[PDB]
Write an enzyme that holds these catalytic residues in place. Sequence first.
Site, PDB file in Angstrom:
ATOM      1  N   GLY A  35    -141.990 -81.886  45.000  1.00 39.94           N
ATOM      2  CA  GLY A  35    -142.430 -83.264  45.057  1.00 39.94           C
ATOM      3  C   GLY A  35    -141.432 -84.242  44.478  1.00 39.94           C
ATOM      4  CG  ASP A  36    -142.506 -88.294  44.677  1.00 41.78           C
ATOM      5  OD1 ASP A  36    -141.839 -88.386  45.736  1.00 41.78           O
ATOM      6  OD2 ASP A  36    -143.713 -88.621  44.605  1.00 41.78           O
ATOM      7  CG  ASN A  38    -137.274 -88.549  39.612  1.00 39.54           C
ATOM      8  OD1 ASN A  38    -137.678 -89.211  38.658  1.00 39.54           O
ATOM      9  ND2 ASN A  38    -137.058 -89.079  40.813  1.00 39.54           N
ATOM     10  CD  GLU A  39    -136.415 -80.603  36.604  1.00 39.65           C
ATOM     11  OE1 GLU A  39    -137.599 -80.896  36.877  1.00 39.65           O
ATOM     12  OE2 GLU A  39    -136.076 -79.501  36.110  1.00 39.65           O
ATOM     13  CG  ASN A  99    -154.241-111.256  45.245  1.00 45.07           C
ATOM     14  OD1 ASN A  99    -154.579-111.991  44.307  1.00 45.07           O
ATOM     15  ND2 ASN A  99    -154.767-110.049  45.434  1.00 45.07           N
ATOM     16  CB  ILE A 141    -150.240-109.852  44.261  1.00 47.59           C
ATOM     17  CG1 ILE A 141    -151.442-108.906  44.287  1.00 47.59           C
ATOM     18  CG2 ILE A 141    -148.992-109.110  44.714  1.00 47.59           C
ATOM     19  CD1 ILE A 141    -151.747-108.328  45.674  1.00 47.59           C
ATOM     20  CD  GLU A 177    -138.952 -87.955  33.458  1.00 51.48           C
ATOM     21  OE1 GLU A 177    -138.712 -87.365  32.380  1.00 51.48           O
ATOM     22  OE2 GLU A 177    -138.094 -88.082  34.364  1.00 51.48           O
TER      23      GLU A 177
HETATM   24 CA   LIG Z   1    -148.938-113.439  45.952  1.00 48.45          CA
HETATM   25 NA    NA Z   2    -141.209 -86.704  47.836  1.00 45.56          NA
END
Ligand SMILES: [Ca+2]
Ligand code: NA
Lengths: 283, 290
Positions: free
Chosen positions: B66-67, B71-72, B236, B239, B262
Amino acid sequence: MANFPASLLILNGKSADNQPLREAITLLRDEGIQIHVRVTWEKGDAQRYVDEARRLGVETVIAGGGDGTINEVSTALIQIRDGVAPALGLLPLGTANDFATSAGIPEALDKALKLAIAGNAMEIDMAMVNDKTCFINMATGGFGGVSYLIHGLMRMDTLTPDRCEIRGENFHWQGDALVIGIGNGRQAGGGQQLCPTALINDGLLQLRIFTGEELLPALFSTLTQSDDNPNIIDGASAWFDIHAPHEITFNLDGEPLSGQEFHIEVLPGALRCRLPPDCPLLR
Amino acid sequence: MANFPASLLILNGKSADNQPLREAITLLRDEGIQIHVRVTWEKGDAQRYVDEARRLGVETVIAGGGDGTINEVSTALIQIRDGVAPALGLLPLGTANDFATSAGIPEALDKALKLAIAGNAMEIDMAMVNDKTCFINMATGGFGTRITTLGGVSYLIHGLMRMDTLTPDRCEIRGENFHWQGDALVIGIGNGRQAGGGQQLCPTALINDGLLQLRIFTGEELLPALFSTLTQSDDNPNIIDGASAWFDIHAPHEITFNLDGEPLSGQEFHIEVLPGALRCRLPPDCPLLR
Ligand SMILES: [Ca+2]
Ligand code: NA
Ligand SMILES: [Ca+2]
Ligand SMILES: [Ca+2]
Ligand SMILES: [Ca+2]
Ligand SMILES: [Ca+2]
Ligand SMILES: [Cl-]
């Protein structure tokens, strides 16, 4: 003269001795054109002459002066009465001519008179605040050299962000605000664009919240930067409810209003106004 | 060196028993293609195998997970200064795979494996925070209370962010031409566009622009804003979007961040992009490419 329905002209005392206008009126009165003239001295007079205007049965009440005079006349023009209210005509003469300018009304005095008397009238909106007061152009609120720009756009001196809550259609925001701008029109305080998208016949009210400690540079900013400025929040709604724990004071086209609660609603097509066929503020 | 340079697959343990993957690799290995396999067990292993991939002169190090795994591998790869480091290859494995998903890599292993080996490489960005931890996809932070002793927005909040209850709190944020301050609920800083399985926090983000995207969610609730369209978002009031090559976050009351899984807590965060710090084999029509 069929192309020139009768008309009452409410003129700000500050222009009571404007000769060029006197001449322009004299000429028109020569062709059988009926142009009544009244001059205001203080707040409250405009109302009095709009009433006489109705009694006289004129088709146009021309406001001769600044945004304050346009506002006073317009306000009196939407007053619920018997019969069809006269249309509003604009003749820019005050120092403050934001609305007139934004609407594109002729600089040439004689050329503006023609539009105000002969032009066609389009129905336009109006904003109401707390059910008592009104404004056709802009409302700006805040809490509490280049100072002239701050005091020129508002009755404020040194602004400070304070907390306030704001509600509208599909709109709910809360936090510390420096300046709250609600416009029917687009500019105020002499050319300062605040609600560049505003239309005076859409049934909406443009909202612009300025957060942060600074403001002036935002004002000198481009439409592209202001859109990327996280401290500028835009909104649009037929109405807005503003609540400020600490009293906030608005400037309704010149008239001050303070308090903790403000209900602001658009009065759709509340009055007819003779605007040029290609007015920038029209849908 | 050819249509299929030698590669070294860094397979995260949690997916070592994947039968289909093993079947694909085997067929490519039959065609003469060289694919080294190393399987990690804990933090640090990825770095050990990237060093080995170097000594083996491979042109690609494929992150099989996965992500977190990506990353590692990327973090180790980013540290190679000696000449040209191997390109990063991607696989759709692992629990959390928002980056590979958003990058549009093939869902089918055999197809994604071939892209990871033969596909073209492009220089992409990586973000680094506080000079210690990096991330190639997304950094989210929430104000409130951490999880004290499975799907959708609930997964993002309680799962990825490991938050108990979100509660707006004061924070100050700075960028190139950005300076906002006030009560915030959730902060999204991404090099990538989505996290928490599908949640699009930084829709405009590009992985090769040398900039980071910021999304600040203000207000008392998060769920509704997350289900807004690309327009309802721009309108919004709660946001706030921003773009910059760096961002300084200051949270008077210790804020908890999440860099691709992490966590990293503190009241001070400096994030800076590392423009084209690594090459990653991507598909021609990659939505994240400028
Ligand atoms: Ca906005
Ligand atoms: Na991924
Ligand atoms: Ca009536
Ligand atoms: Ca309007
Ligand atoms: Ca903006
Ligand atoms: Ca980037
Ligand atoms: Cl005036």
